[PDB]
Amino acid sequence: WPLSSQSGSYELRIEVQPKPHHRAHYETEGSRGAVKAPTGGHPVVQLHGYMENKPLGLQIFIGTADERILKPHAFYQVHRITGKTVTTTSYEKIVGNTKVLEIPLEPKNNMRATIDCAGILKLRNADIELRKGETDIGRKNTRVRLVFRVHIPESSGRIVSLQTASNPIECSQELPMVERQDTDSCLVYGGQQMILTGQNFTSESKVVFTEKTTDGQQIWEMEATVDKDKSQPNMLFVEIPEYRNKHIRTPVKVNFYVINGKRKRSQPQHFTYHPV
Amino acid sequence: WPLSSQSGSYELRIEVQPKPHHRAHYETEGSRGAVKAPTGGHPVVQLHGYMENKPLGLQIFIGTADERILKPHAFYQVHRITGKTVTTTSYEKIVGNTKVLEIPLEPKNNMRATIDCAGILKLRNADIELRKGETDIGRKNTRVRLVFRVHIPESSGRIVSLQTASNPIECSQELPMVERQDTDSCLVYGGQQMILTGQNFTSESKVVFTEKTTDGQQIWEMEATVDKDKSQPNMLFVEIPEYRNKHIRTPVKVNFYVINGKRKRSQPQHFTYHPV
DNA sequence: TTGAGGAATTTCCA
DNA sequence: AATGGAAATTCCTC
């Protein structure tokens, strides 16, 4: 529905936001999986002020993230994952030019709902812009927001319709960047703390040290553990790794980079090791 | 023609081989240009033993590079560039399920021909494998060879058919990273050699030194020439540049970075200059 | 169209 | 079914 709503006398809140990224899939591919949450779980929606003992139907559809008139995204449609097992929530498929998922919000769970039945299909830019009426374009526009709605019936006969939107979700298959290093060196034993000040640093970021021969033959590689804290979206706390040879009589130049998965390595950062 | 030939009593030789790479184009795009030669010119084909004063027709078609039964490539077709001007050779378009270009080989030029009217179209994998008969596949198979043929008529009535093939031609279309510096300093005069050990280093890589005021106003910038060798995919040989002021009575801190085009600069690398 | 360089979508694989 | 990883084929832009 293009009309905007909010959170009237009660309140519909997203208790658990979905990961910032989520590669969507095409009709040409097979499901690319449900929208997952950073916690390794799934996003969670909850209706608070409801006291009655009647189950409502939470509605889920994919909407726009940028611009600003929250509306169904023309190039994305929620996908009903048929989790023969993994699925913890029942589903239903409706329409209105855009597909909508309806999951039950039951008081049994304190009107709380785990969303692990929602995927993200991606229609083909051409196929869309090709239909009479649409003026928006797909190109470069792949940000999305999960939209949740509930239609609360009050004994008085009225219908209160709340709605909420997740944070933005990138839906396309963005690398790390280091600007400053808390420390520049340390000695063989390691231990000392190094705080990296940069960008794109996510909870899934990794830091690895490496040493190469003047040619390029990497002879050393070791992952230095990041930190227990949520760190920061632009700050990492790395515990300098130990070295492979404490018995050095001259400092040793090495490198360390930040990586986010596979094809996501930051430029090599310089770091030296002083002999005992 | 699937049948193989060679170089009988005369000889058909490629006097100038085509560059190893050449991004081909789709019917969906516009010509991506004629096949060019490393010399900046174009490939050149020549028939030697011919003495008669009659022009023959050199035939050009795109064939397979790998495997080994030199044959028309099913996913590539020569493209007749309509060089309203740049074109130095006339052309003709034939068939046989595969398109063939026929350029004239005239004695005026010593039966020599400059090939600057040949491009490389790329049919769509699906569109091909979809036709009854073909069993080969496009996927990962994008190597090609320019094939040239001549049909030499001998007064005796016979027909001698020679043929030759260019070297293989790749037909298909990420910032630098410095991990180690061979040298750390040098003095004003420069000259000394510096070997950079990193990644992504391509033949088109450049190295520039720079100096800035504590604010950021860059007052010095000079490109230090790389090296004649193919260097390495992870190793560069830079000849330290000269400095702008030999008359310094104190060392000077400067920087140097590796760049691949425009938006491809590596982090600034530290380097100092000692006074005479 | 011609002629490319540089990406962003779609399709494909293991 | 669910994804991670790429090749392919469109798309922009000048």
Side-chain angles (χ1 to χ4, degrees), chain A residues 212-257:
Chain A
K212 295 179 174 58
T213 67
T214 305
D215 186 298
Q217 300 309 310
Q218 172 183 180
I219 68 291
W220 187 48
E221 165 172 289
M222 186 157 275
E223 170 182 57
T225 56
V226 65
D227 219 59
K228 57 181 176 61
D229 292 301
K230 58 185 63 183
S231 301
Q232 285 298 315
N234 53 178
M235 196 164 93
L236 287 185
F237 310 81
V238 181
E239 175 182 57
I240 303 171
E242 191 187 308
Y243 193 58
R244 62 152 185 169
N245 178 56
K246 168 279 179 181
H247 295 67
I248 62 175
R249 293 307 134 199
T250 288
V252 179
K253 304 176 179 65
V254 299
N255 302 88
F256 76 79
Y257 60 65

Coordinates of all heavy atoms in Angstrom, one line a residue, chain A residues 212-257:
Chain A
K212 N 56.4 -11.2 3.2 CA 56.8 -11.7 1.9 C 58.2 -11.5 1.6 O 58.8 -10.6 2.2 CB 55.9 -11.1 0.8 CG 54.4 -11.5 0.9 CD 53.6 -10.8 -0.2 CE 52.2 -11.2 -0.2 NZ 51.5 -11.0 1.1
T213 N 58.8 -12.3 0.7 CA 60.2 -12.1 0.3 C 60.2 -11.0 -0.7 O 59.1 -10.8 -1.4 CB 60.7 -13.4 -0.3 OG1 60.0 -13.7 -1.5 CG2 60.5 -14.6 0.7
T214 N 61.3 -10.4 -0.9 CA 61.3 -9.3 -1.9 C 60.6 -9.6 -3.2 O 60.2 -8.7 -3.9 CB 62.8 -8.9 -2.2 OG1 63.4 -8.6 -0.9 CG2 62.9 -7.7 -3.1
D215 N 60.5 -10.9 -3.5 CA 59.8 -11.3 -4.8 C 58.3 -11.1 -4.6 O 57.7 -10.3 -5.2 CB 60.1 -12.8 -5.1 CG 59.5 -13.2 -6.5 OD1 58.3 -13.1 -6.6 OD2 60.3 -13.6 -7.3
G216 N 57.8 -12.0 -3.7 CA 56.4 -11.9 -3.4 C 55.9 -13.2 -2.7 O 54.7 -13.4 -2.4
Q217 N 56.9 -14.2 -2.6 CA 56.5 -15.4 -2.0 C 56.2 -15.2 -0.5 O 57.1 -15.0 0.3 CB 57.7 -16.4 -2.1 CG 58.0 -16.8 -3.6 CD 56.8 -17.1 -4.4 OE1 56.0 -18.0 -4.1 NE2 56.7 -16.5 -5.6
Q218 N 54.9 -15.3 -0.2 CA 54.4 -15.1 1.2 C 54.9 -16.3 2.0 O 54.5 -17.4 1.8 CB 52.9 -15.0 1.2 CG 52.3 -15.0 2.5 CD 50.7 -15.0 2.5 OE1 50.1 -15.0 3.5 NE2 50.2 -14.9 1.2
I219 N 55.7 -16.0 3.1 CA 56.1 -17.1 4.0 C 55.4 -17.1 5.3 O 55.5 -18.1 6.1 CB 57.7 -17.1 4.2 CG1 58.1 -15.8 5.0 CG2 58.4 -17.1 2.8 CD1 57.9 -14.5 4.3
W220 N 54.8 -16.0 5.6 CA 54.1 -15.9 6.9 C 52.7 -15.3 6.7 O 52.4 -14.4 5.9 CB 54.8 -15.0 7.9 CG 54.2 -15.0 9.3 CD1 53.8 -16.1 10.0 CD2 54.0 -13.9 10.1 NE1 53.3 -15.7 11.2 CE2 53.4 -14.4 11.3 CE3 54.2 -12.5 9.9 CZ2 53.0 -13.5 12.4 CZ3 53.8 -11.7 11.0 CH2 53.2 -12.2 12.2
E221 N 51.7 -15.9 7.5 CA 50.4 -15.5 7.4 C 49.7 -15.9 8.7 O 49.7 -17.1 9.1 CB 49.6 -16.1 6.3 CG 48.1 -16.0 6.4 CD 47.4 -16.5 5.1 OE1 47.5 -15.8 4.1 OE2 46.8 -17.6 5.1
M222 N 49.2 -14.9 9.5 CA 48.5 -15.2 10.7 C 47.4 -14.2 11.0 O 47.6 -13.0 11.0 CB 49.5 -15.3 11.9 CG 48.9 -15.7 13.2 SD 50.1 -16.3 14.3 CE 50.2 -18.1 13.7
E223 N 46.2 -14.8 11.4 CA 45.1 -13.9 11.7 C 45.1 -13.5 13.2 O 45.1 -14.2 14.1 CB 43.8 -14.7 11.5 CG 42.5 -14.1 12.0 CD 41.3 -14.9 11.8 OE1 41.2 -16.1 12.3 OE2 40.3 -14.4 11.2
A224 N 45.1 -12.1 13.3 CA 45.1 -11.5 14.7 C 43.7 -11.3 15.0 O 42.9 -10.7 14.3 CB 45.9 -10.2 14.6
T225 N 43.2 -11.9 16.1 CA 41.8 -11.8 16.6 C 41.4 -10.4 16.9 O 42.1 -9.6 17.5 CB 41.6 -12.6 17.8 OG1 42.5 -12.2 18.9 CG2 41.8 -14.1 17.5
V226 N 40.2 -10.0 16.4 CA 39.7 -8.7 16.6 C 39.2 -8.6 18.1 O 39.8 -9.1 18.9 CB 38.5 -8.4 15.6 CG1 37.3 -9.4 15.9 CG2 38.0 -6.9 15.7
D227 N 38.1 -7.9 18.3 CA 37.6 -7.8 19.7 C 36.1 -8.1 20.0 O 35.2 -7.8 19.3 CB 38.1 -6.5 20.3 CG 38.5 -6.6 21.7 OD1 39.5 -7.4 22.0 OD2 37.9 -5.9 22.6
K228 N 36.0 -8.6 21.3 CA 34.7 -9.0 21.9 C 33.6 -7.9 21.7 O 32.4 -8.2 21.6 CB 34.9 -9.3 23.3 CG 35.5 -8.1 24.1 CD 35.7 -8.4 25.6 CE 36.4 -7.3 26.3 NZ 35.7 -6.0 26.3
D229 N 34.0 -6.6 21.7 CA 33.0 -5.6 21.6 C 32.5 -5.5 20.1 O 33.1 -6.1 19.2 CB 33.7 -4.2 21.9 CG 34.0 -4.1 23.4 OD1 33.0 -4.2 24.3 OD2 35.2 -3.9 23.8
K230 N 31.4 -4.7 20.0 CA 30.8 -4.5 18.7 C 31.7 -3.6 17.9 O 31.4 -3.1 16.8 CB 29.4 -3.9 18.8 CG 29.4 -2.5 19.6 CD 28.0 -2.0 19.8 CE 27.2 -2.9 20.6 NZ 25.8 -2.5 20.8
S231 N 32.9 -3.4 18.5 CA 33.9 -2.5 17.9 C 33.3 -1.2 17.5 O 32.7 -0.5 18.3 CB 34.6 -3.2 16.6 OG 35.2 -4.4 17.0
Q232 N 33.3 -0.9 16.2 CA 32.6 0.3 15.7 C 32.5 0.1 14.1 O 33.1 -0.7 13.5 CB 33.5 1.5 16.0 CG 33.5 2.0 17.4 CD 32.1 2.5 17.9 OE1 31.4 3.2 17.1 NE2 31.7 2.1 19.1
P233 N 31.6 0.9 13.5 CA 31.4 0.8 12.1 C 32.6 1.4 11.4 O 32.7 1.3 10.1 CB 30.2 1.7 11.8 CG 29.4 1.6 13.2 CD 30.6 1.8 14.1
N234 N 33.5 2.0 12.1 CA 34.7 2.6 11.6 C 35.9 2.6 12.6 O 36.8 3.4 12.6 CB 34.4 4.1 11.3 CG 33.9 4.9 12.5 OD1 33.6 6.1 12.4 ND2 33.7 4.2 13.6
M235 N 36.0 1.5 13.3 CA 37.1 1.3 14.3 C 37.2 -0.1 14.8 O 36.2 -0.7 15.2 CB 36.8 2.3 15.5 CG 38.0 2.5 16.4 SD 37.6 4.0 17.5 CE 37.0 3.2 18.9
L236 N 38.4 -0.7 14.6 CA 38.6 -2.1 15.0 C 39.7 -2.1 16.1 O 40.7 -1.4 16.1 CB 39.1 -2.9 13.8 CG 38.0 -3.3 12.8 CD1 38.6 -4.3 11.8 CD2 36.8 -4.0 13.5
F237 N 39.6 -3.1 17.0 CA 40.5 -3.3 18.1 C 41.2 -4.7 17.9 O 40.7 -5.7 18.3 CB 39.8 -3.4 19.4 CG 38.9 -2.2 19.7 CD1 37.6 -2.2 19.1 CD2 39.3 -1.1 20.4 CE1 36.7 -1.1 19.3 CE2 38.4 0.0 20.6 CZ 37.2 0.0 20.0
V238 N 42.4 -4.6 17.2 CA 43.1 -5.8 16.9 C 44.2 -6.1 18.0 O 45.0 -5.2 18.4 CB 43.8 -5.7 15.5 CG1 44.6 -7.0 15.2 CG2 42.7 -5.5 14.5
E239 N 44.4 -7.4 18.3 CA 45.4 -7.8 19.3 C 46.6 -8.2 18.4 O 46.6 -9.4 17.9 CB 44.9 -8.9 20.2 CG 46.0 -9.4 21.1 CD 45.5 -10.6 22.0 OE1 45.1 -11.6 21.4 OE2 45.7 -10.5 23.2
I240 N 47.6 -7.4 18.3 CA 48.8 -7.8 17.6 C 49.2 -9.2 17.8 O 49.3 -9.7 18.9 CB 50.0 -6.9 18.0 CG1 49.6 -5.4 17.8 CG2 51.2 -7.3 17.1 CD1 50.7 -4.4 18.3
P241 N 49.4 -10.0 16.7 CA 49.7 -11.4 16.7 C 51.2 -11.6 17.1 O 52.0 -10.6 17.1 CB 49.5 -11.9 15.3 CG 50.0 -10.7 14.5 CD 49.3 -9.5 15.3
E242 N 51.5 -12.8 17.5 CA 52.9 -13.2 17.9 C 53.7 -13.3 16.6 O 53.1 -13.4 15.5 CB 52.8 -14.5 18.7 CG 54.0 -14.9 19.4 CD 53.9 -16.3 20.0 OE1 52.9 -16.6 20.7 OE2 54.8 -17.2 19.7
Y243 N 55.0 -13.4 16.7 CA 55.8 -13.6 15.5 C 56.3 -15.0 15.4 O 56.3 -15.7 16.4 CB 56.9 -12.6 15.4 CG 57.6 -12.5 14.1 CD1 56.8 -12.1 13.0 CD2 58.9 -12.8 13.9 CE1 57.4 -12.1 11.7 CE2 59.5 -12.8 12.6 CZ 58.8 -12.5 11.5 OH 59.3 -12.5 10.3
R244 N 56.8 -15.4 14.2 CA 57.2 -16.7 14.0 C 58.7 -17.0 14.4 O 59.2 -18.1 14.4 CB 57.1 -17.1 12.5 CG 57.9 -16.2 11.6 CD 58.3 -17.0 10.3 NE 59.2 -16.1 9.5 CZ 59.9 -16.6 8.4 NH1 59.8 -17.9 8.1 NH2 60.7 -15.8 7.7
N245 N 59.4 -15.9 14.8 CA 60.8 -16.1 15.2 C 61.2 -15.0 16.2 O 61.7 -13.9 15.7 CB 61.7 -16.1 14.0 CG 63.2 -16.2 14.3 OD1 63.6 -17.2 15.0 ND2 64.0 -15.3 13.9
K246 N 61.2 -15.3 17.5 CA 61.6 -14.4 18.5 C 63.1 -14.0 18.4 O 63.5 -13.0 18.9 CB 61.2 -14.9 19.9 CG 61.8 -14.2 21.1 CD 63.3 -14.6 21.3 CE 63.9 -13.8 22.5 NZ 65.3 -14.2 22.8
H247 N 63.8 -15.0 17.9 CA 65.3 -14.9 17.8 C 65.8 -14.1 16.7 O 66.6 -14.5 15.9 CB 65.9 -16.3 17.8 CG 65.7 -17.0 19.1 ND1 64.5 -17.5 19.5 CD2 66.6 -17.3 20.1 CE1 64.6 -18.0 20.7 NE2 65.9 -18.0 21.0
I248 N 65.3 -12.8 16.5 CA 65.7 -12.0 15.4 C 66.7 -10.9 16.0 O 66.4 -10.4 17.1 CB 64.6 -11.3 14.7 CG1 63.8 -10.4 15.7 CG2 63.6 -12.3 14.1 CD1 62.7 -9.5 15.0
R249 N 67.7 -10.6 15.3 CA 68.7 -9.6 15.8 C 68.5 -8.3 15.0 O 69.5 -7.5 15.0 CB 70.1 -10.1 15.7 CG 70.4 -11.3 16.6 CD 70.0 -10.9 18.0 NE 69.3 -12.0 18.7 CZ 68.5 -11.8 19.8 NH1 68.4 -10.6 20.4 NH2 67.9 -12.8 20.3
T250 N 67.4 -8.1 14.3 CA 67.1 -6.9 13.5 C 65.6 -6.9 13.3 O 65.0 -7.9 13.0 CB 67.8 -6.9 12.2 OG1 69.2 -6.7 12.4 CG2 67.3 -5.9 11.2
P251 N 65.0 -5.7 13.4 CA 63.6 -5.5 13.2 C 63.1 -6.1 11.9 O 63.9 -6.2 10.9 CB 63.4 -4.0 13.3 CG 64.7 -3.4 12.9 CD 65.7 -4.4 13.7
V252 N 61.8 -6.5 11.8 CA 61.3 -7.1 10.6 C 60.0 -6.4 10.1 O 59.0 -6.3 10.8 CB 61.0 -8.6 10.8 CG1 60.4 -9.2 9.5 CG2 62.3 -9.3 11.2
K253 N 60.0 -6.0 8.8 CA 58.9 -5.3 8.2 C 57.8 -6.4 7.8 O 58.2 -7.4 7.2 CB 59.3 -4.5 7.0 CG 60.4 -3.5 7.2 CD 60.8 -2.9 5.9 CE 61.9 -1.8 6.0 NZ 63.2 -2.4 6.5
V254 N 56.6 -6.1 8.1 CA 55.5 -7.0 7.8 C 54.3 -6.2 7.3 O 54.4 -5.0 7.3 CB 55.1 -7.9 8.9 CG1 56.2 -8.8 9.4 CG2 54.5 -7.1 10.1
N255 N 53.2 -6.9 7.0 CA 52.0 -6.2 6.6 C 50.8 -6.9 7.2 O 50.8 -8.0 7.7 CB 51.8 -6.3 5.1 CG 53.0 -5.7 4.3 OD1 54.0 -6.3 4.0 ND2 52.9 -4.4 4.1
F256 N 49.7 -6.1 7.2 CA 48.4 -6.6 7.7 C 47.3 -6.0 7.0 O 47.4 -4.8 6.7 CB 48.4 -6.4 9.3 CG 48.0 -5.0 9.6 CD1 46.7 -4.5 9.6 CD2 49.0 -4.1 10.1 CE1 46.4 -3.2 10.0 CE2 48.7 -2.8 10.5 CZ 47.4 -2.3 10.4
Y257 N 46.3 -6.7 6.7 CA 45.2 -6.2 5.9 C 43.8 -6.6 6.6 O 43.7 -7.5 7.4 CB 45.2 -6.7 4.5 CG 45.1 -8.2 4.3 CD1 44.0 -8.9 4.7 CD2 46.2 -8.9 3.7 CE1 43.9 -10.3 4.5 CE2 46.1 -10.3 3.6 CZ 45.0 -11.0 3.9 OH 44.9 -12.3 3.8

